[PDB]
Design a protein around this motif. Structure first.
Motif, PDB file in Angstrom:
ATOM      1  N   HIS A   1       1.333   3.919  -2.944  1.00 15.87           N
ATOM      2  CA  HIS A   1       0.240   4.770  -3.391  1.00 15.87           C
ATOM      3  C   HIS A   1       0.627   6.119  -2.617  1.00 15.87           C
TER       4      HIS A   1
ATOM      5  N   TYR B   1       0.819  -1.428  -0.019  1.00 14.62           N
ATOM      6  CA  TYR B   1       0.020   0.102   0.070  1.00 14.62           C
ATOM      7  C   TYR B   1       0.900   1.250   0.045  1.00 14.62           C
TER       8      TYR B   1
ATOM      9  N   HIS C   1      -2.507  10.632   3.965  1.00 12.19           N
ATOM     10  CA  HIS C   1      -3.802  10.837   3.556  1.00 12.19           C
ATOM     11  C   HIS C   1      -4.824   9.692   3.752  1.00 12.19           C
ATOM     12  N   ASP C   2      -4.316   8.504   3.865  1.00 13.40           N
ATOM     13  CA  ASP C   2      -5.072   7.183   4.016  1.00 13.40           C
ATOM     14  C   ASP C   2      -4.836   6.468   5.272  1.00 13.40           C
TER      15      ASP C   2
ATOM     16  N   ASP D   1      -4.347  12.492  -5.368  1.00 12.12           N
ATOM     17  CA  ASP D   1      -4.686  11.153  -5.059  1.00 12.12           C
ATOM     18  C   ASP D   1      -5.636  10.565  -6.344  1.00 12.12           C
TER      19      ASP D   1
HETATM   20 MN   LIG Z   1      -6.102   7.373  -1.542  1.00 10.34          MN
END
Ligand SMILES: [Mn+2]
Ligand SMILES: Nc1nc2c(ncn2[C@@H]2O[C@H](COP(=O)(O)OP(=O)(O)O)[C@@H](OP(=O)(O)OP(=O)(O)O)[C@H]2O)c(=O)[nH]1
Ligand SMILES: [Cl-]
Ligand SMILES: [Mg+2]
Length: 350
Positions: free
Chosen positions: A47, A44, A71-72, A141
């Protein structure tokens, strides 16, 4: 393992203490997304790193690129917004919560099919995000998301593309982020109208070899001219001379609305000049330099290639409604061909 060592170079424009916050942010993200994977099979962490990378290319606020890495983290990571304010401050927290909260808010929102639907939804994000950085990160994003859209079903590929074309690409325009607006459009077009995209793309890739041959003559020539100018170079830290990529969605949009074929539409050659001014002692000194250096180049471009009367456009002095700044000039070059030159600084490049 290539991550970070890939990003770090892009952070060169930030103060050491700022880069330090971005390493702390990356490492925190690296932990939060440990063991998580993308629908691509990649870990992940790839990203948020890619999103942070985009923002650093766009030369954003340190808090913004750190927020790009984070951001995630507020979902499926066991991270509370309190942890992000505690460690990275309230601005990073504000932005990450902002980008997270909106994605869900758009999922709830019911304007699907109603006339001028996008406009009322775009204004919804505008009205709630007073800090535009929230929107910028959301754009960065969606950009990376579209770049990796091959690992998604054709239902999602078409859903995402349309949404980007209705919501995010116009928002990128409102914010004066043309580099993003372009990329978002051309990528959305790819996945939304594949048959129409593959047809147009192959028609350009038929003459592309001869076009960039011509464009490189202009690039090399304009590059050497600038590098040889002692006085411009003294006020300059670096520069980039590059061709303007064809806006395939804008090409095709016209091609349908006013009829005609790709051969029928005139391929006006364009070249861009991005200038990196040398750091000036004061904020005023730097501000005057930013303009000074651009007009310096305009002169050199006319000295090199014969200007076409009336084709000088000053958007530094009179920015476009969306704040767009650049110097435009249409000249004659390559043995009698019209060439457009866009002169701007690194700050102006969006
Ligand atoms: Mn995202
Ligand atoms: N393009 C792409 N997306 C992937 C991939 N792997 C996982 N995703 C996730 O898919 C989400 C986007 O579409 P959805 O499939 O509907 O996920 P969702 O149900 O939570 O909305 C993204 O979160 P998001 O940041 O909230 O984007 P979004 O939900 O605002 O569209 C992204 O993290 C991948 O390999 N490529
Ligand atoms: Cl472009
Ligand atoms: Mg997205």
């Amino acid at each position: 393992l290539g991550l970070w060592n890939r990003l770090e170079p892009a952070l060169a424009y930030l103060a050491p203490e700022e880069r330090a916050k971005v390493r702390e942010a990356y490492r925190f993200a690296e932990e939060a997304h440990r063991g998580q994977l993308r629908r691509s099979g990649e870990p992940y962490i790839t990203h948020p790193v890619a999103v942070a990378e985009i923002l650093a290319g766009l030369q954003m606020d340190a808090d913004t690129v750190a927020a790009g890495l984070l951001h995630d983290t507020l979902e499926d990571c066991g991270v509370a917004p309190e942890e992000l304010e505690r460690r990275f401050g309230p601005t990073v927290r504000r932005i990450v919560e902002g980008e997270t909260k909106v994605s869900k808010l758009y999922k709830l929102a019911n304007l699907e099919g109603e006339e001028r639907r996008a406009e009322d939804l775009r204004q919804m994000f505008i009205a709630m995000a007073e800090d535009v950085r929230i929107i910028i990160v959301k754009l960065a994003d969606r950009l990376h998301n579209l770049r990796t859209l091959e690992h998604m079903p054709p239902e999602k590929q078409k859903r995402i593309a349309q949404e980007t074309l209705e919501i995010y690409a116009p928002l990128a325009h409102r914010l004066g982020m043309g580099q993003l607006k372009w990329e978002l459009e051309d990528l959305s077009f790819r996945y939304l109208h594949p048959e129409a995209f593959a047809s147009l793309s192959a028609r350009i890739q038929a003459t592309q070899e001869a076009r960039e041959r011509l464009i490189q003559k202009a690039i090399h020539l304009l590059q050497e001219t600038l590098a040889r100018d002692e006085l411009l170079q003294s006020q300059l830290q670096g520069f980039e001379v590059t061709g303007r990529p064809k806006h395939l969605y804008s090409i095709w949009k016209k091609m349908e609305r006013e009829g005609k074929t790709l051969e029928q539409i005139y391929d006006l050659l364009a070249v861009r000049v991005i200038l990196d001014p040398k750091p000036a002692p004061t904020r005023e000194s730097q501000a005057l330099r930013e303009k000074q250096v651009c007009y310096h180049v305009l002169g050199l471009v006319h000295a090199l290639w014969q200007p076409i009367p009336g084709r000088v456009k000053d958007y530094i002095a009179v920015p476009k409604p969306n704040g767009y700044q650049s110097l435009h000039t249409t000249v004659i070059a390559l043995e009698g061909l019209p060439l457009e030159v866009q002169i701007r600084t690194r700050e102006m490049h969006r």
